[PDB]
PDB file of C-alpha atoms and ligand atoms in Angstrom:
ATOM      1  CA  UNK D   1      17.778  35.008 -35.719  1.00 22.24           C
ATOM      2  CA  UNK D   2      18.654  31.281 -34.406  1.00 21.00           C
ATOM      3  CA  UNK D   3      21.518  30.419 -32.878  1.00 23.18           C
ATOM      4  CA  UNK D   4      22.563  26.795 -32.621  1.00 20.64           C
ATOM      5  CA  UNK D   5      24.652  25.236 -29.726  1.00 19.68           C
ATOM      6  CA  UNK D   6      25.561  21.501 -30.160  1.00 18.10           C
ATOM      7  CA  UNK D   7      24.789  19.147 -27.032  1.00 20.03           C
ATOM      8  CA  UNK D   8      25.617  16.053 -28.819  1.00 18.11           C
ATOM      9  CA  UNK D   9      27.318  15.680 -32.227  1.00 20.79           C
ATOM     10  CA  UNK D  10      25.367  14.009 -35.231  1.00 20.15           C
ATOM     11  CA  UNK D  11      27.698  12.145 -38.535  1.00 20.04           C
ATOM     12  CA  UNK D  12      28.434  15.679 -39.085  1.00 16.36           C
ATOM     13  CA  UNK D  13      27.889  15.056 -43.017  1.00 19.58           C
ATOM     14  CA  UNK D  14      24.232  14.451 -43.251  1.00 24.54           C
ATOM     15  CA  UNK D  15      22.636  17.984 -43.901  1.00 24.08           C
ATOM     16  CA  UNK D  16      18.426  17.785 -44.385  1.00 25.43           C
ATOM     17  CA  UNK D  17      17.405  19.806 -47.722  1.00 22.03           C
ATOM     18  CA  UNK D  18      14.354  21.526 -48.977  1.00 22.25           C
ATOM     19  CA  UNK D  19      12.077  19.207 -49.535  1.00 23.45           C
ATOM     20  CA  UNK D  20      12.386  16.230 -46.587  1.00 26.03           C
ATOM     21  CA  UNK D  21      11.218  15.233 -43.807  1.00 24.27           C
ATOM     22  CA  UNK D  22      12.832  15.544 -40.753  1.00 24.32           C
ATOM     23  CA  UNK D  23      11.961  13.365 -37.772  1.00 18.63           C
ATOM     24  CA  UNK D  24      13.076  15.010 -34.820  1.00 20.63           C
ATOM     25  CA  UNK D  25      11.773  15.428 -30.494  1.00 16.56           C
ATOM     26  CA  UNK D  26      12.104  18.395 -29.298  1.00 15.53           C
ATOM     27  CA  UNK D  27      10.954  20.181 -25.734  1.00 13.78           C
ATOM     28  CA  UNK D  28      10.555  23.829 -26.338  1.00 17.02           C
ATOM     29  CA  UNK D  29      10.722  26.420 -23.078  1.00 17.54           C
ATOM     30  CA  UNK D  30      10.082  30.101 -22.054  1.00 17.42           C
ATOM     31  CA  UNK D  31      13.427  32.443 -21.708  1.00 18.93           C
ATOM     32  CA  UNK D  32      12.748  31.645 -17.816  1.00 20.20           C
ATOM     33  CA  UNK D  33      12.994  27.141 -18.246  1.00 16.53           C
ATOM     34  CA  UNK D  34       9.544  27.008 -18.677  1.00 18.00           C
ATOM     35  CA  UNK D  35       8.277  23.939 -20.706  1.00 20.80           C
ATOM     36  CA  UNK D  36       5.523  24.777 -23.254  1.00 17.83           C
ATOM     37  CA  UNK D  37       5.656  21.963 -25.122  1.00 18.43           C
ATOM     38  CA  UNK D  38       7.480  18.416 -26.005  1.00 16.15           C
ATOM     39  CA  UNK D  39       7.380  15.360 -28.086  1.00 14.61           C
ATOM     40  CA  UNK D  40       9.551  13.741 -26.006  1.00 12.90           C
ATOM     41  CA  UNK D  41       6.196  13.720 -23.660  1.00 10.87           C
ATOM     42  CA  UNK D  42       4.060  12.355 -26.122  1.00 10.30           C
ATOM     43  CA  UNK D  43       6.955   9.896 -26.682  1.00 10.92           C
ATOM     44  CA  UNK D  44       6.005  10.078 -29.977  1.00 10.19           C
ATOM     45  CA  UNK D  45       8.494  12.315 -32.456  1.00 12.01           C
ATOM     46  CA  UNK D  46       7.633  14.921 -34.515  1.00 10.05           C
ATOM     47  CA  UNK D  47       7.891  15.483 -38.485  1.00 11.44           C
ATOM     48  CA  UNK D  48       8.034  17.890 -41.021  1.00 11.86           C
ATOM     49  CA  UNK D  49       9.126  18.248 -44.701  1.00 13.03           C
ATOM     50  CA  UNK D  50      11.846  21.088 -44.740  1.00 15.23           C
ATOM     51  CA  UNK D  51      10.980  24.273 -47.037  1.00 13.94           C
ATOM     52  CA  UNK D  52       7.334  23.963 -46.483  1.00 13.27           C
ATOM     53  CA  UNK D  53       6.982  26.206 -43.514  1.00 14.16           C
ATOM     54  CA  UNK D  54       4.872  24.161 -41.582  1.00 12.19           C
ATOM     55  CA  UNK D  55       7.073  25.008 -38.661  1.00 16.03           C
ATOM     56  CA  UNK D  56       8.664  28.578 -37.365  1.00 16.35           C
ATOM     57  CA  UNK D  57      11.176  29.928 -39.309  1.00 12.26           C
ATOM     58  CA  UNK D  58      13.837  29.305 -36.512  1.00 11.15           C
ATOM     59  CA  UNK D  59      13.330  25.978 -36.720  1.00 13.39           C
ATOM     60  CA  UNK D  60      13.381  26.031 -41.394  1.00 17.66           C
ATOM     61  CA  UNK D  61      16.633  28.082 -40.784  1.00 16.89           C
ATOM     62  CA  UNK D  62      18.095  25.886 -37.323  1.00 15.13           C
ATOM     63  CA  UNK D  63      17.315  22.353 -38.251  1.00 15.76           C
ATOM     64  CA  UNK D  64      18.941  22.781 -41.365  1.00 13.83           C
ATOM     65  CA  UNK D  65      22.371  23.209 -40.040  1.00 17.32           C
ATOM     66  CA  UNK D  66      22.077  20.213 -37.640  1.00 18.86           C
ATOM     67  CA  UNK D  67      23.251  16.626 -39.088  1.00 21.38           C
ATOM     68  CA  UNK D  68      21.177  13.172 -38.386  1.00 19.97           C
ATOM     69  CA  UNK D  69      21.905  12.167 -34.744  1.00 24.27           C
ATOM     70  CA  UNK D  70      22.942  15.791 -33.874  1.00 22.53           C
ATOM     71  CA  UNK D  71      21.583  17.057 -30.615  1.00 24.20           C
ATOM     72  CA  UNK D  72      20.981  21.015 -30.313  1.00 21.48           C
ATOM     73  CA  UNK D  73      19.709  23.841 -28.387  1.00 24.91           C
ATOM     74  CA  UNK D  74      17.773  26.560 -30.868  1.00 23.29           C
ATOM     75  CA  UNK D  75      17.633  30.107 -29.398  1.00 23.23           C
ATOM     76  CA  UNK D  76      14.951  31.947 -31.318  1.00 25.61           C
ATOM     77  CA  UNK D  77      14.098  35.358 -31.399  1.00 24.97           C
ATOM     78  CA  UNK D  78      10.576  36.373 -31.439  1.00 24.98           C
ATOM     79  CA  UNK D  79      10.910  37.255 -34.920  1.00 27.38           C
ATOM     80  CA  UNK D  80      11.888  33.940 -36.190  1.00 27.39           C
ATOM     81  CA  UNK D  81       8.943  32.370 -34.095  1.00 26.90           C
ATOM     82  CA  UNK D  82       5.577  33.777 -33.155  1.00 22.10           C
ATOM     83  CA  UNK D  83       6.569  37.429 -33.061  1.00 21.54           C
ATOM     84  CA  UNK D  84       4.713  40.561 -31.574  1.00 22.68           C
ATOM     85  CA  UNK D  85       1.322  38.917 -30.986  1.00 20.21           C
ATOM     86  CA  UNK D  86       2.891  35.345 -29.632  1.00 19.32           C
ATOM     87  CA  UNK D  87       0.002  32.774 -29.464  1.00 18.35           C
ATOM     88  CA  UNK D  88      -2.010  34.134 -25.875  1.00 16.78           C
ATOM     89  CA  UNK D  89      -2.401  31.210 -23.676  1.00 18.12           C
ATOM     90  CA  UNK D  90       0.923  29.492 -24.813  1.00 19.35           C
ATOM     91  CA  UNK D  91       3.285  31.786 -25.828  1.00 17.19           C
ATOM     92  CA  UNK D  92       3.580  35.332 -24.794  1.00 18.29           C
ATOM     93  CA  UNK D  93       4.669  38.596 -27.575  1.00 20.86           C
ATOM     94  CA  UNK D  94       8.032  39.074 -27.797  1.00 20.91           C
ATOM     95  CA  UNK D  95       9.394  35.421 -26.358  1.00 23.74           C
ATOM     96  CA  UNK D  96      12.560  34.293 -27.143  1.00 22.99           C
ATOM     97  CA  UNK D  97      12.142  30.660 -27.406  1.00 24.47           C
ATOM     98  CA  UNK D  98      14.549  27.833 -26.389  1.00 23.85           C
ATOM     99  CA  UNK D  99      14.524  24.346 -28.130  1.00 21.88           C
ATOM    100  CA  UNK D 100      16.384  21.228 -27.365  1.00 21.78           C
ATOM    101  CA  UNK D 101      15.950  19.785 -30.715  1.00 20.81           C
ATOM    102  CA  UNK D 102      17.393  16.104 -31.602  1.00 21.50           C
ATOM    103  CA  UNK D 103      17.496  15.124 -35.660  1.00 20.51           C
ATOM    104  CA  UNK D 104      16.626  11.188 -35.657  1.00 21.91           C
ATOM    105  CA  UNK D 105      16.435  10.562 -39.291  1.00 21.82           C
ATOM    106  CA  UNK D 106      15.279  12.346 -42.439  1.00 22.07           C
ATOM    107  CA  UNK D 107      12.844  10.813 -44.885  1.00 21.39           C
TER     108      UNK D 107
HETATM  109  N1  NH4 G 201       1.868  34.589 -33.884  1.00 22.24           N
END
């Protein structure tokens, strides 16, 4: 599954829902600290609309119990991300992914 570890507290009453968008940056790394990937690179954040899995399930299952302004780390199994056949190149089978996720806002 996901487990979520606070780094920096959000209102702690803002929960997203099915249905919006949730602006976040992330940087997501290898068991070992390797980066794979980061919108905090880009400097440009990410979005998605919650429910629609357009993102792993990890993150449909994490992001939900984080509150606007909260600042987590996601542990994912492979199961909850890109499972047995990972994506070759990026992501190998069977990773266990960490993400240091930050909610901005939800639209
Ligand atoms: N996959």
């Amino acid at each position: 599954g996901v487990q979520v570890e606070t780094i920096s507290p959000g209102d702690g009453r803002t929960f997203p829902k099915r249905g919006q968008t949730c602006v976040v940056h992330y940087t997501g790394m290898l068991e070992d600290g390797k980066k794979f990937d980061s919108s905090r690179d880009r400097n440009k954040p990410f979005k998605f609309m919650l429910g629609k899995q357009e993102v792993i399930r990890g993150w449909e299952e994490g992001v939900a119990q984080m509150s606007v302004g909260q600042r987590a780390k996601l542990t994912i199994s492979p199961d909850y991300a890109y499972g047995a056949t990972g994506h070759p190149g990026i992501i190998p089978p069977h990773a266990t992914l960490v993400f240091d996720v930050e909610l901005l806002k939800l639209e």
